[PDB]
Amino acid sequence: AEKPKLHYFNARGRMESTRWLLAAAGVEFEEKFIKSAEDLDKLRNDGYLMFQQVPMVEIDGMKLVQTRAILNYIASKYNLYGKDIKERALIDMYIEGIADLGEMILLLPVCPPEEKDAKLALIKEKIKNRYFPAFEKVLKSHGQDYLVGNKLSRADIHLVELLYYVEELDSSLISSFPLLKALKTRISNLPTVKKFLQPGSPRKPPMDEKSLEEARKIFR
Amino acid sequence: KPKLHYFNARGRMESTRWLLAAAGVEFEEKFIKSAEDLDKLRNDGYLMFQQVPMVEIDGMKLVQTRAILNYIASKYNLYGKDIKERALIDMYIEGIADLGEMILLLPVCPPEEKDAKLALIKEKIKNRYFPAFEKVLKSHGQDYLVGNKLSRADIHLVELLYYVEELDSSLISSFPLLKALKTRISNLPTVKKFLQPGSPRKPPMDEKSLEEARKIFR
Ligand SMILES: N[C@@H](CCC(=O)N[C@@H](CS[C@H](CC=O)c1ccccc1)C(=O)NCC(=O)O)C(=O)O
Numbered sequence: 204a205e206k207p208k209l210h211y212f213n214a215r216g217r218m219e220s221t222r223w224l225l226a227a228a229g230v231e232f233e234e235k236f237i238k239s240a241e242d243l244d245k246l247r248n249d250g251y252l253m254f255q256q257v258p259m260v261e262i263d264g265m266k267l268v269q270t271r272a273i274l275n276y277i278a279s280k281y282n283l284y285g286k287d288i289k290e291r292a293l294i295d296m297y298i299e300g301i302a303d304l305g306e307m308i309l310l311l312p313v314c315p316p317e318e319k320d321a322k323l324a325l326i327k328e329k330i331k332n333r334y335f336p337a338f339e340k341v342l343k344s345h346g347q348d349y350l351v352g353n354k355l356s357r358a359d360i361h362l363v364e365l366l367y368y369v370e371e372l373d374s375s376l377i378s379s380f381p382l383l384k385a386l387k388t389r390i391s392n393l394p395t396v397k398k399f400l401q402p403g404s405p406r407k408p409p410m411d412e413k414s415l416e417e418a419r420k421i422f423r
Numbered sequence: 424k425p426k427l428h429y430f431n432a433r434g435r436m437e438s439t440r441w442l443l444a445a446a447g448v449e450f451e452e453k454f455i456k457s458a459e460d461l462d463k464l465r466n467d468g469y470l471m472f473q474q475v476p477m478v479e480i481d482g483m484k485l486v487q488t489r490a491i492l493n494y495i496a497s498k499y500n501l502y503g504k505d506i507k508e509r510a511l512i513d514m515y516i517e518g519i520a521d522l523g524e525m526i527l528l529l530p531v532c533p534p535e536e537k538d539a540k541l542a543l544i545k546e547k548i549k550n551r552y553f554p555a556f557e558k559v560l561k562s563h564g565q566d567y568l569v570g571n572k573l574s575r576a577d578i579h580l581v582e583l584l585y586y587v588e589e590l591d592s593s594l595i596s597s598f599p600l601l602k603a604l605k606t607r608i609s610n611l612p613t614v615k616k617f618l619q620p621g622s623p624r625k626p627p628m629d630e631k632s633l634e635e636a637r638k639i640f641r
């Protein structure tokens with residue numbers, strides 16, 4: 204059979220959460236890197252992109268576009284999306300808050316430097332007073348190793364990935380949240396995630412301007 | 424019965440109203456009128472992220488639009504029949520939500536950006552989103568987007584067609600199969616009742632309602 208093909212460019216961007224999720228499932232995948240605006244145009248003209256956008260993922264006979272369609276399919280296929288509809292609602296509620304915070308962080312580099320540290324200061328405030336207490340409260344509520352159902356789920360994977368990006372932005376932001384610290388350690392120590400965290404994995408670095416201008420030339 | 428917590432406007436709650444109505448589910452709305460009433464919900468712990476939309480359903484206090492919709496869609500069997508059908512649906516509705524998001528945020532755009540944003544919305548409507556969804560319908564020829572059966576993808580898409588009509592009734596004119604889907608879904612019994620006067624369906628957001636919103640969300 205065929206292992207899934209990730210079509211993006213060589214950066215975190217909107218593909219990284221899927222890299223984390225497939226790796227944590229222990230699924231091997233290939234990446235076909237888009238290197239120019241002409242590579243993007245070839246995927247368009249070939250009819251591979253429903254909305255002429257990437258992320259695109261070739262899996263199980265489909266060409267899935269949209270971040271949330273790809274992740275939902277992968278999370279369901281590998282039993283990381285809860286056991287029932289109610290657990291799914293909890294998972295979805297949790298991960299969509301994570302998506303909201305992950306979005307602000309993702310779009311820090313290509314905001315006008317006129318507003319960067321105004322935006323960054325509000326990202327930091329929402330972390331300390333809104334998102335980090337919300338999840339710490341969830342972990343305190345049940346005292347189990349995983350956010351939902353006492354079983355590893357996509358919520359745990361998505362949250363811990365964001366914990367890493369929060370650490371990159373301000374390492375002190377986690378310090379008053381002991382249960383988030385512990386989750387971060389336990390999840391990072393799962394053999395699949397620990398491999399993915401070790402060098403030479405498909406995990407991607409933070410975006411420098413070198414790759415920000417590459418993304419500028421590919422997406423115009 | 425489900426209890427919808429939002430303010431008296433479309434906002435991020437309308438697509439839930441549409442989806443519940445199409446599934447023939449009666450609901451109550453608890454309208455927020457002040458920032459005071461929003462803080463009542465927050466301090467009472469009802470909002471996980473201190474935000475609405477929030478829906479009381481089946482014992483839970485679900486915030487996040489997509490958590491609400493995904494749960495209602497599965498409960499009332501509008502999420503397809505397997506995860507490959509849910510993946511087609513998800514790919515479709517996320518395109519819809521991308522365009523819907525642009526339209527939802529037009530009135531709150533900075534006034535100097537509004538001419539450009541509206542032009543862009545129309546360009547993507549005409550060249551990206553409507554051709555994408557017409558090609559789906561032309562590809563299998565069926566009356567519904569997925570599985571030859573009604574699903575949330577049809578409901579979300581038709582809802583968005585009404586917002587495109589309000590913005591520019593010419594935009595759908597070159598897309599015959601979208602037109603026919605709009606009328607077919609409009610004439611489904613539960614949807615036809617929702618579209619009629621006096622339903623919970625909300626109007627476009629005028630000036631008064633928009634500054635009601637800013638006061639509530641400080
Ligand atoms: N809802 C969808 C959205 C899909 C989407 O916006 N894809 C984009 C590339 S990501 C972006 C590009 C940089 O400027 C970036 C890359 C790095 C950092 C920040 C942003 C794209 O393909 N743009 C082409 C076009 O819109 O025509 C989904 O979640 O999948």
Ligand SMILES: N[C@@H](CCC(=O)N[C@@H](CS[C@H](CC=O)c1ccccc1)C(=O)NCC(=O)O)C(=O)O
Nearest residue numbers: 303434435473474475476486487488527531636640
């Ligand atoms: N990801 C989440 C987001 C939830 C979300 O952003 N809720 C907001 C109200 S909607 C917005 C408010 C107007 O300024 C509006 C309403 C009408 C028109 C345009 C914008 C809220 O509660 N804001 C309080 C706060 O953030 O402190 C979800 O999709 O569910």
